Amino acid sequence: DILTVEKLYRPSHEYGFLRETDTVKDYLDLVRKNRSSRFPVINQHQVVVGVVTMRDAGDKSPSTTIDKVMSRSLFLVGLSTNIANVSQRMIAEDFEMVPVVRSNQTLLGVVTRRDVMEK
Ligand SMILES: [Cl-]
Ligand code: NA
């Protein structure tokens, strides 16, 4: 198949991302600025270390760091990944967002469910 993640993904500065040393307050502020609620989380090496959702952070202390509330990130894709395979897993496992990473697991951005389903 010719349709890959590269053609559909959203770079991290467009979609949004959090640092593991950011706080729950920073997450709530990003939700209102970006109108999205699920973000990849990176460490100081730019490596994806988790994902943060409203289920993870909504009821937490605003002062708490993201590394202490974030969820595990197991589904990761690359630029060459087939969109058909991504859609199959997003449907079967009910994902809204999947982080896009380089071979060294550093963050490039995300693919969203609406973009995958519409294309
Ligand atoms: Cl998700
Ligand atoms: Na947005």
Coordinates of C-alpha atoms and ligand atoms in Angstrom, one line a residue:
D1 CA 0.0 0.0 0.0
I2 CA 1.3 3.5 -0.8
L3 CA -0.6 5.4 2.0
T4 CA 1.9 5.9 4.9
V5 CA 2.0 7.8 8.2
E6 CA 4.3 10.4 6.6
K7 CA 1.5 11.7 4.4
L8 CA -1.1 12.1 7.4
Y9 CA 0.9 12.8 10.5
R10 CA 0.8 16.1 12.5
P11 CA 4.2 17.5 13.7
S12 CA 4.5 17.8 17.5
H13 CA 4.5 21.6 17.6
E14 CA 1.2 21.7 15.6
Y15 CA -0.7 18.9 17.6
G16 CA 0.9 19.4 21.0
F17 CA 3.3 17.5 23.3
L18 CA 4.2 17.5 27.0
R19 CA 7.6 17.1 28.7
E20 CA 7.7 14.6 31.6
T21 CA 8.9 17.5 33.9
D22 CA 5.8 19.7 32.8
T23 CA 2.9 19.7 35.3
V24 CA -0.8 18.7 35.2
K25 CA -1.5 22.5 35.1
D26 CA 0.6 22.7 31.9
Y27 CA -1.5 19.7 30.5
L28 CA -4.8 21.4 31.3
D29 CA -3.6 24.7 29.7
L30 CA -2.5 22.8 26.5
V31 CA -5.9 21.1 26.3
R32 CA -7.6 24.5 26.1
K33 CA -5.1 26.1 23.7
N34 CA -5.1 23.0 21.3
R35 CA -8.6 21.6 21.8
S36 CA -7.1 18.1 22.2
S37 CA -6.7 16.0 25.3
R38 CA -4.3 13.1 24.5
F39 CA -0.6 14.0 24.1
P40 CA 2.7 12.2 23.8
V41 CA 5.2 12.8 26.6
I42 CA 9.0 13.2 26.0
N43 CA 12.0 13.1 28.3
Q44 CA 15.0 15.4 28.1
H45 CA 16.5 13.1 25.4
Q46 CA 13.3 13.7 23.3
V47 CA 12.3 10.0 23.7
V48 CA 8.6 9.2 24.0
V49 CA 8.2 7.9 27.6
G50 CA 4.4 7.8 27.8
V51 CA 1.1 9.4 26.8
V52 CA -1.2 11.7 28.9
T53 CA -5.0 11.6 28.6
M54 CA -7.8 13.3 30.5
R55 CA -8.4 10.0 32.3
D56 CA -4.8 10.2 33.5
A57 CA -4.6 13.8 34.6
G58 CA -8.2 15.3 35.0
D59 CA -8.5 14.7 38.8
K60 CA -4.8 15.0 39.7
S61 CA -3.1 17.9 41.6
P62 CA -2.2 20.7 39.2
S63 CA 1.4 20.8 40.7
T64 CA 2.1 17.0 40.0
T65 CA 4.6 16.3 37.2
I66 CA 3.4 14.5 34.1
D67 CA 5.8 11.5 34.5
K68 CA 3.8 10.6 37.7
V69 CA 0.4 10.6 36.0
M70 CA 1.1 9.5 32.4
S71 CA 0.0 6.2 30.9
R72 CA 2.3 3.6 29.1
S73 CA 2.9 4.2 25.3
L74 CA 3.2 0.7 23.6
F75 CA 1.7 1.6 20.1
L76 CA 4.2 3.7 18.2
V77 CA 4.5 4.2 14.5
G78 CA 7.1 5.5 12.0
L79 CA 6.9 7.7 8.8
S80 CA 7.0 4.5 6.6
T81 CA 4.2 2.7 8.5
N82 CA 1.2 1.6 6.4
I83 CA -2.0 3.5 7.4
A84 CA -4.1 0.4 6.8
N85 CA -2.2 -1.4 9.7
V86 CA -2.5 1.7 11.9
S87 CA -6.3 1.9 11.3
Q88 CA -6.8 -1.8 12.1
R89 CA -5.2 -1.3 15.5
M90 CA -6.8 2.0 16.3
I91 CA -10.2 0.4 15.7
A92 CA -9.5 -2.9 17.5
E93 CA -7.9 -1.2 20.6
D94 CA -10.0 2.1 20.4
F95 CA -7.1 4.6 20.0
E96 CA -7.7 8.3 19.3
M97 CA -4.0 9.2 18.8
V98 CA -0.7 7.4 18.1
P99 CA 2.7 8.9 18.5
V100 CA 5.1 9.0 15.5
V101 CA 8.8 8.4 16.3
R102 CA 12.2 8.0 14.7
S103 CA 14.0 4.6 14.9
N104 CA 15.7 6.0 18.1
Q105 CA 12.2 6.5 19.6
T106 CA 12.4 10.3 19.6
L107 CA 9.1 12.2 18.9
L108 CA 8.2 13.4 15.4
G109 CA 4.4 14.1 16.0
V110 CA 1.1 12.1 16.1
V111 CA -1.5 10.5 13.8
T112 CA -5.1 11.2 14.8
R113 CA -8.0 8.8 14.4
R114 CA -10.1 11.3 12.4
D115 CA -7.4 11.8 9.8
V116 CA -6.8 8.0 9.5
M117 CA -10.4 7.2 9.1
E118 CA -11.2 10.1 6.7
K119 CA -8.2 9.0 4.5
Ligands
CL1 CL -5.6 7.3 22.4
NA2 NA -5.5 21.2 17.9

